[PDB]
Amino acid sequence: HHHHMKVSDILTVAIRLEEEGERFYRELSEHFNGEIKKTFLELADQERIHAEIFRKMSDQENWDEVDSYLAGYAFYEVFPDTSEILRRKDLTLKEVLDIAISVEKDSIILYYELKDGLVNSDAQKTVKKIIDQEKEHLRKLLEMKREST
Description:
It is classed as unknown function. The protein is mainly α. It has five helices and no strands.
């Protein structure tokens, strides 16, 4: 590792969080039923689009930017292994949301870290858009927790 993370290391991390998030939310939608199913699927499509933006970015950002060190400790957790619980046929919305909320918060910190490491002001604006959308996913997750849990 978390010291001497490069910008490019962090984009790779961010790409995977968005890809894994897509999968999580799409797989979660198999456990649930209504407006809730629809929500998880929207969240999955949104995460998809985000990953496509981050992949394009790691390809097209200038090498000197991307190859630069973020000073200090770059926090991140890679997406949890969820294969076992997602095998279960009796999952509650609560336990699922608790997990979603916790990894979403972990991923938000990381996208902030990334934004701070970008030097190109277009790249930073692109990532702020994603962060804002991620923070709305989070609000939706807390809304579902509060309401239907």
